[PDB]
Design a binder for this molecule. Structure first.
Ligand SMILES: O=C(O)c1ccnc(CNCc2ccccc2)c1
Ligand code: NI
Ligand SMILES: [Zn+2]
Length: 349
């Protein structure tokens, strides 16, 4: 039934009306009813009338506290990315750097050419990324798809324990320039994520279907055996870059899509993804959940080599939504096998 919906597991694109757009969790359930989740990543173009902010003219004075210089080492489509933290800077200082001749986007015709240039020049002229900035650019009154307050069941973490994890249950802003990258990863606890590109140049994405995520992990383990040896989930370090040609060469299925200003990207549980920015831009993102996430959360293999990493207690979720399984789960005897094709039960509605 669900296995015959989006059988190719290709990135789908949706165009909600304003009526459909008003209810966030309902539209996520809807796009899962269409098999969007099988790709691991989906685009949602909001209705033309909608805007999350009047204008972006008043933000040049906003501080980027921990900008990162991205140094990349490698060859043959396999790279490791090292972060160098730089001194704080404003958006204006960042924009001047980004649009300067040294760091700006090279000339091209089609995306294919720019993509070839990215993979060719990845290790040269290391760019600076204004990443992981706490904040939102949504105006206080906007109620539709507000990244600061989506109001999904992930709110059970703050409600229960009081804990906020920066980026996870709070919003983060991302100021890109040309050739800034996000490495291959799933979300913390294999959650969903939502990314909105506020303005500027495009952001391109790669995605591997959740039903082939394990194929990618095996490949990564083969190429980085030392990293695998010292961490059970080293891809969560967000340092590993793998070109589409390497994926194609080892038979890993994947898709690509370019995100444009004013468009949303949703990543789904266990949806590995990576990409880069075309030029100067600004993106906002956070994690969220559905009832279907819970099982992914229970089975998520976490980073074992760093004390300061994101761990969510799954108790509250199992207790509330799977009371019949809670005694079995605490005993370490819950052998539920995840079927990556099933939509979230809210999609009945
Ligand atoms: O640089 C990017 O555009 C980018 C793209 C895709 N994923 C990330 C990081 N995982 C999403 C996330 C962001 C912020 C808070 C919590 C989760 C970043
Ligand atoms: Ni992500
Ligand atoms: Zn680790």
């Amino acid at each position: 039934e669900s296995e015959t919906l989006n059988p190719s597991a290709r990135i789908m694109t949706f165009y909600p009306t304003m009526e459909e757009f008003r209810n966030f969790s309902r539209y996520i359930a809807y796009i899962e009813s269409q098999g969007a989740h099988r790709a691991g990543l989906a685009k949602v173009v909001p209705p033309k009338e909608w805007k999350p902010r009047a204008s972006y003219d008043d933000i040049d004075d906003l501080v980027i506290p921990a900008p990162i210089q991205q140094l990349v080492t490698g060859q043959s489509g396999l790279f490791t990315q090292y972060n160098i933290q730089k001194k704080a800077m404003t958006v204006r200082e960042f924009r001047k750097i980004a649009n300067s001749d040294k760091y700006c986007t090279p000339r091209y015709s089609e995306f294919e050419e720019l993509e070839r240039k990215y993979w060719k020049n990845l290790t040269f002229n290391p760019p600076i990324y204004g990443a992981d900035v706490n904040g939102t650019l949504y105006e206080k009154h906007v109620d539709e798809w507000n990244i600061g307050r989506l109001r999904t069941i992930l709110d059970l973490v703050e409600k229960e324990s009081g804990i906020t994890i920066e980026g996870v249950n709070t919003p983060y802003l991302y100021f890109g320039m040309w050739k800034t990258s996000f490495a291959w990863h799933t979300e913390d606890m294999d959650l969903y994520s939502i990314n909105y590109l506020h303005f500027g140049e495009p952001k391109s994405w790669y995605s591997v279907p959740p039903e082939h995520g394990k194929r990618l992990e095996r490949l990564a383990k083969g190429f980085f055996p030392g990293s695998a040896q010292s961490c059970e989930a080293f891809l969560r370090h967000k340092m590993t870059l793998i070109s589409p040609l390497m994926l194609k060469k080892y038979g890993i299925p994947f898709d690509k899509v370019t995100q444009e200003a004013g468009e949303f990207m949703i990543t789904f549980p266990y949806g590995y993804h990576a990409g880069f920015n075309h030029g100067f831009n600004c993106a906002e993102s956070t994690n969220f959940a559905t009832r279907r996430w819970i099982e992914y959360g229970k089975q998520a293999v976490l980073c074992s080599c760093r004390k300061d990493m994101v761990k969510i207690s799954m108790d509250v979720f199992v207790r509330k939504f799977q009371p019949e399984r809670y005694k079995l789960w605490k005993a370490g005897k819950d052998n539920t096998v995840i079927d990556h094709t099933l939509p979230t039960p809210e999609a009945a509605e």
